[PDB]
């Protein structure tokens, strides 16, 4: 007993989407449902590494303040919508991609100059809509490697970086029991993620990050 | 990817009971994440060592009284519940105690051993108050973890204990409060390296140089289920 | 599942839903029939309410 605390097994992957899953553990010792649920939360939401769009250069603009015509939604929205694009960068710190399109209709991330060195993991992401017989737009999009979520605090247009792929993570603890006690915790972790990584593996990455800290103490 | 990993660079046993320990350096957030995880683990899950039964020579139940002693037998049990000791490689031990003559009775009166070590000799069990007075008793100690109330314990023993034993509630967990704090420190000519300080108050049976590693171990193995998925 | 309103959409008198749910649950518990809905080892109480969801019960049956 004295050093053989109860260990969970995954009760389910409980998967409802490729984007979101409800990985549940049972039993955990009393109170550990927070001690791990939140600990992995704080890892997952803020200290997972990854790659994201970081800066934009649409043709001839000094500030997204300038609502250049030919596009339906103004540049403040194109700027955030380009933050919406999930991307994978292989082996590099920062990479610039180019995008252009022409003709009346939408623009999509599928229209980017796909290097193959970089994967746009969701091509069908609409970027904007075009609004004249002569409508075409061309831009450089910078993608960068980094960690967590970094706000707009630091012709280029700066934007917040979504390096962590976790769109949301949440967790609960709840009653679970065995044949003789009910003071034990279940843990439900729910998370939703941008498609760069599947969640039942993102958590295995995160559990590793946390485990690596302990490696200098564990006997 | 640039993660600096911690080492437990320093410790200060400020008292025979209280100590500080520091883990350094840490990245963003990990000062908080470990800072709270280890506090919550240290409070729940450090193993320790408690009195668990007491047999006193002439008493019959908790509510009685002994001639020539200043406490109801009950307040003797409330006193022994707080007594704390190390035991060396044992799941339990029995301590004999004897005293006679007027004055205090204190843990220093227990029949000492090499394999038991008491954190505070002056913790007081009762007073004797008559010239011929005595008490003799067999305090049984057990190892364990968390807290186990005697009412559930005897319901877990399932044989019928003899008349004239007393039972006490078990409170093994040896740490009474834990605090954590995070701050920046000089390493590599750079900022946002957290020196985590954890500082702790204990019953005196354990030293942080074990305790923080044991807590980290518990965490590290509980966490296996999330990488083994 | 618990709120029976979608069964009341089908038995538009709410009293008849108790008389019909009881009758059908008795055909299961007592009459020895078994459900046309997939059972999950629910009580007949719930099975009969889940038999209204398949849209295949009224007091003709």
């Amino acid at each position: 007993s004295v050093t053989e605390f109860l260990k969970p097994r995954l009760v389910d992957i409980e998967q409802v989407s490729s984007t979101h899953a409800k990985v549940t553990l049972e039993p955990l010792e009393r109170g550990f449902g927070h001690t791990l649920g939140n600990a992995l939360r704080r890892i997952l939401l803020s200290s997972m590494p990854g790659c994201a769009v970081t800066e934009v250069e649409i043709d001839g603009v000094l500030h997204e303040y300038s609502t250049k015509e030919g596009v339906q939604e103004d540049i403040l929205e194109i700027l955030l919508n380009l933050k919406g694009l999930a991307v994978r960068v292989q082996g590099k710190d920062e990479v610039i991609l180019t995008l252009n399109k022409s003709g009346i209709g939408p623009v999509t991330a599928a229209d980017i100059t796909h290097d193959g060195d970089v994967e746009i993991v969701k091509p069908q992401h609409v970027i904007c809509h075009l609004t004249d017989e002569n409508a075409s737009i061309s831009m450089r999009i910078k993608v960068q490697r980094g960690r967590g979520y970094v706000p707009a605090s630091t012709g280029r247009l700066l934007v917040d970086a979504c390096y962590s792929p976790v769109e949301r993570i949440a967790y609960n603890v709840e009653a679970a029991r065995v044949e003789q006690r009910t003071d034990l915790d279940k843990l439900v972790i729910e998370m939703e993620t941008n498609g760069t990584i599947d969640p039942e593996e993102a958590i295995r990455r995160a559990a590793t990050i946390l485990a690596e800290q302990l490696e200098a103490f564990v006997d | 990817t640039e993660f600096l990993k911690p080492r437990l660079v320093d410790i200060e046993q400020v008292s025979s009971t209280h100590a500080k320990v520091t883990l350094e350096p840490l990245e963003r957030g990990f000062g908080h994440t470990l800072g709270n995880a280890l506090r919550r683990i240290l409070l729940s899950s450090m193993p320790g060592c408690a009195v668990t039964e007491v047999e006193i020579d002439g008493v019959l139940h908790e509510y009685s009284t002994k001639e020539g002693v200043q406490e109801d037998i009950l307040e003797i049990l409330l006193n022994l519940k707080g007594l704390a000791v190390r035991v060396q490689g044992k799941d339990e031990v029995i301590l004999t105690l004897n005293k006679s003559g007027i004055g205090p009775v204190t843990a220093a009166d227990i029949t000492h051993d090499g394999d038991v070590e008491i954190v505070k000799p002056q913790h007081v069990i009762c007073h004797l108050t008559d010239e011929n007075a005595s008490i003799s008793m067999r305090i049984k100690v057990q190892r364990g973890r968390g807290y186990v109330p005697a009412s559930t314990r005897i319901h877990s023993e399932e044989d019928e204990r003899p008349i004239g034993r007393l039972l006490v509630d078990a409170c093994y967990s040896p740490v009474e409060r834990i605090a954590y704090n995070v701050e920046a420190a000089r390493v590599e000519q750079r900022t946002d390296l957290d020196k985590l300080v954890i500082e702790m108050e204990t019953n005196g049976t354990i030293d942080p140089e074990e305790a923080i590693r044991r807590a980290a171990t518990i965490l590290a193995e509980q966490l296996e289920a999330f990488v083994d998925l | 599942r618990v709120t029976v309103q979608d069964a009341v959409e089908k038995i538009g008198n709410r009293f008849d839903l108790v008389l019909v749910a009881a009758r059908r649950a008795r055909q299961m518990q007592v009459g020895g029939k078994d459900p046309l809905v997939p059972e999950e080892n629910d009580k007949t109480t719930v099975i009969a309410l889940r038999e209204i969801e398949e849209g295949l019960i009224n007091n003709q049956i």
Partner: protein, 100 residues
């Protein structure tokens, strides 16, 4: 003890008669949480008497409402006491203050 009170506790606990109160002044001769016994001083003794006031305390006993009522000493051997000092706490008292 309540940490914040009104100073009426020093009266309710004594006048309610449930703390055992020193009938005459003297010195504590013996104590054992069942008896307390006081060597009364000759300035308040009656001349033919032994001169010794025992107080056999009531120990664990049912109240009319089934709560226990064990009195406990507050004195120490050889301690002086004066007429009307609390010798022994009642239920719900300590050092003679009310303490619910």
């Amino acid at each position: 003890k309540p940490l914040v009170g009104t100073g009426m506790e020093r009266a309710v606990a004594v006048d309610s008669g449930v703390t055992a109160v020193a009938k005459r002044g003297g010195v504590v001769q013996y104590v054992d949480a069942s008896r307390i016994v006081i060597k009364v001083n000759e300035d308040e003794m009656y001349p033919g008497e032994a001169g010794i006031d025992i107080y056999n305390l009531t120990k664990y006993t049912r109240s009319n409402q089934n709560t226990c009522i064990n009195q406990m000493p507050c004195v120490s051997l050889g301690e002086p006491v004066e007429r009307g000092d609390v010798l022994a706490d009642g239920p719900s008292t300590d050092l003679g203050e009310l303490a619910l």
